[PDB]
């Protein structure tokens, strides 16, 4: 079988940069090479085929070059929506095989989060559980610290976080932290607070609410 | 429009079989091969085989030979991929893709285009469980500088995935649907949020459309400010 070796495995670049991604075949495949883009949550999409032909409808900043064993995908002017994983693929011989993929990430300016907090819904409380959600919206870089305080007591062991992939329009992250308690424990305290620390904030930001108000 | 629409995600026990379908529309069905490609956790892509829907002939990657069967039903322009004796590392996103021919690289027809949306097959002994959907209501504590945040919490489901749309697809700007977390119970949870003008919470309607296909759960939840 033909092995396809892609490099680099990942690259961080700025909007407007020229980016090059390489793919090396283990043997000569002439021009039987394609490049695909896989955006988050989506199927791959053909960008370039026959090493250098542009697929209809694909922005022309994506171009390909090379023949034989060494191939290059070029993005001439990187855009935020180019955050994606790119794969080469040979069609010279079955089995058709792919490179391991190159993850493209976008560098941008610092952006402070907007912070929102949600008490549990009355519907959920009826079921016996209280989920309290803290949202950090549209920040950069990804490093962020979320601390839960319940009646000014720092919490540990009862929250989970999830972060989005970089946004396709502004390259920021968003993050949810969910504090989960029994309805009984929830009803034993008044003040629920989410304290956010991030490079874009001069001082930590706290969003809080009093249970039942 | 040329499109390939695949069947929904499924959980299957180790040793069982799964049969994924790929409904083609908008092109001459017998005029293109249908290929299958799968994507494991490490996001590598792995070609599985093809079916020629005109002749019915197939060709499978040696890795899946004896375990995969590709078939088609021309009368409903649908292809199928059945993978038997499922094992833990068969957990993957399975894609169908259209390929025009295998002998002329210079044509755009003769590469994977388009692809189906993928079908997540989870190989595990646990039973399917549908999610609960709770509102994340906009309030004074989720309103900063003229913008309000609101959302839906989608809790306690198995296996992945759930999809969330807003207002049946008409609301996409500012939506963030978070990657699922694995709870200690073994069930998944995620939230989907959107930011909107605070000025119009009284006049706009915000409904999250939650789909968990493994359990045939579809939930539309209206999210409104709490009185
Ligand atoms: Cl060679
Ligand atoms: Cl409520
Ligand atoms: Cl509306």
Author numbering:
A (entry chain L): 1 to 213
B (entry chain H): 1 to 227
Question: Could you pull the original sentences from the published paper?
Answer:
Beta-32 is highly potent against all variants reported here.
The RBD mutations found in Alpha (N501Y), Beta (K417N, E484K, and N501Y), Gamma (K417T, E484K, and N501Y), and Delta (L452R and T478K) are located in or closely adjacent to the ACE2-interacting surface where they have the potential to modulate ACE2 interaction or disrupt the binding of neutralizing mAbs. To understand this, we generated 674 mAbs from Beta-infected individuals and performed a detailed structure-function analysis of the 27 most potent mAbs: one binding the spike N-terminal domain (NTD), the rest the receptor-binding domain (RBD). A detailed structure-function analysis comprising 22 X-ray and cryo-EM structures is presented for 16 Fabs most in complexes with RBD or S, which allows an understanding of the changes in antigenicity of the Beta S protein.
